[PDB]
């Protein structure tokens, strides 16, 4: 039950795996038994779901024994489980996609506070561990705020997010 | 709930195709001059 993390805008590879090496059938159904992708001979056939124009596959690795699934421009509404059906198994993976950013676009002054907004899928409890070049290793829950935003605090602070022991790095836009 | 003599289907020839016995594109020679016809019988249907 491997679990992977996203960044709400980047790519990801949820790869199945087999051993025959003969370009065999497979599919990628979500948690609602709805098709998304799947080999049909040597062609491709996107499923009638809400991931029409984003789904794709590496059509050159189907012969080696790997059937990845590249989804571009990830969105919050995609966090869910996925199932391979390579030959007879039920190889399953979980995906969790969220975004942590700021609200003040550019207008910021020295001596004010900094606030972060993290949009995790409902029913999730990520941990926000800020890491900064100044050493302010601020630790807290999903929502974290900084009471000091000075000139020395310039640069993108690295508030990583940890969930199930897996850590994903972020960046914060600071304008002063 | 379909209708109420001829159903027309537009068709466009191609010259760059994808092979069906593997993976990879392919190209063919230019098309023929004209007067191309085909009469066919339909028997089955895959869904």
């Amino acid at each position, epitope marked *: 039950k491997k679990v992977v993390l996203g960044k709400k805008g980047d790519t990801v590879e949820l790869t199945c795996t087999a051993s025959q090496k003969k370009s065999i059938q497979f599919h990628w159904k979500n948690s609602n038994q709805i098709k998304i992708l799947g080999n049909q001979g040597s062609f491709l056939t996107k499923g009638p779901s809400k991931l029409n*124009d984003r789904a794709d596959s590496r059509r050159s690795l189907w012969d080696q024994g790997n059937f990845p699934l590249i989804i571009k421009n990830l969105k919050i509404e995609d966090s869910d489980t996925y199932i391979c059906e390579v030959e007879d198994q039920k190889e399953e993976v979980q995906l969790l996609v969220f975004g942590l950013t700021a609200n003040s676009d550019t207008h910021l002054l020295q001596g004010q506070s900094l606030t972060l907004t993290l949009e995790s899928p409902p029913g999730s409890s990520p941990s926000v561990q800020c890491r900064s070049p100044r050493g302010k290793n601020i630790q807290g829950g999903k929502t974290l705020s900084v009471s000091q935003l000075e000139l020395q605090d310039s640069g993108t602070w690295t508030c990583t997010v940890l969930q199930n022991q897996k850590k994903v790095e972020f960046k914060i836009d600071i304008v002063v | 709930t379909d209708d109420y003599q001829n159903i027309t289907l537009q068709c466009r020839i191609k*010259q760059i195709i994808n092979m069906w016995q593997g993976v*990879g594109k392919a190209m063919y020679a230019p098309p023929i001059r004209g007067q191309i016809r085909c009469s066919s019988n339909i028997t089955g249907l895959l869904l």
Partner: antibody, heavy 118, light 112 residues
Framework: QVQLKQSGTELVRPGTSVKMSCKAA????????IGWVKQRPGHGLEWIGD????????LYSENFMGKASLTANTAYMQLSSLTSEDSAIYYC???????????????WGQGTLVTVSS | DIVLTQSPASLAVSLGQRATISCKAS??????????MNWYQQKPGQPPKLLIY???NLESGIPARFSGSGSGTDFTLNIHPVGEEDAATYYC?????????FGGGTMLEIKR
């Protein structure tokens, strides 16, 4: 049938970064490269870089290092350190992948004008 | 980088006359017997349209008034019957090896 559309004319200051958009049409766009083209009078027309959406691949020429940048059905351009020399017309083409991306492609786009003036 | 030279720089054509434009290449572009030439047409106020490809395989939509021939570093694009709408500039392009280079462009104006 593939059709390419580009945004309106742009007039920008020099030395800044300029954003361009070339929207696709009702075609997959996922297995096709996209070449970006610059045209200036008395020069013919020159290519900047070629960008693949099916993997976000990049192919550059030896004349646009540190100036051009490409991103990914709505592709975009990223030009940095703009100068008067870049006031010109810009186009986006279609293509393919799996080799011979632009070896035998077709179906060009319309174009847009960029004016570098103060 | 290959250097492509299109000739002549200027040319005059009378109506209903065969028109030929030549393209010279510094380095061979051949690979497995193929000619990797692309020919484009350009009219003022409109973008270039792909005219011919491969020098041996024609496009759609464009009439059969067109052809290309040659070998190696010497190619020729040929047009018949020259009409009124063909007053434009023509470009020869190599697709064999990067970087994608260009020629100087050949003008063509109808003579009546």
């Amino acid at each position: 049938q593939v059709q390419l559309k580009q945004s309106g004319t742009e007039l920008v200051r020099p030395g800044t970064s300029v954003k361009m958009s070339c929207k696709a049409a009702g075609y997959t766009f996922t297995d096709y490269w996209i070449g970006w083209v610059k045209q200036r009078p008395g020069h013919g027309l020159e290519w900047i870089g070629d960008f693949y959406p099916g993997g976000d691949y990049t192919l550059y020429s030896e004349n646009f290092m540190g100036k051009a940048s490409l991103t990914a059905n709505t592709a975009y351009m990223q030009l940095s350190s703009l100068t008067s020399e870049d006031s010109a017309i810009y186009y986006c083409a279609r293509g393919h992948y799996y080799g011979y991306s632009y070896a035998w492609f077709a179906y060009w786009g319309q174009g847009t004008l960029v004016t570098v003036s103060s | 980088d290959i250097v492509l030279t299109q000739s002549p720089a200027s040319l005059a054509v009378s109506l209903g006359q065969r028109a030929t434009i030549s393209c010279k290449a510094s380095q061979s572009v051949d690979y497995d017997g193929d000619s990797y030439m692309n020919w484009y047409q350009q009219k003022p106020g409109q973008p270039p349209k792909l005219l011919i490809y491969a020098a041996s395989n024609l496009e759609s939509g464009i009439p059969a008034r067109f052809s290309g021939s040659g070998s190696g570093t010497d190619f020729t694009l040929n047009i018949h019957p020259v009409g009124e709408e063909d007053a434009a500039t023509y470009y020869c392009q190599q697709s064999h090896e990067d970087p994608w280079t260009f020629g100087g462009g050949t003008m063509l104006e109808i003579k009546r």
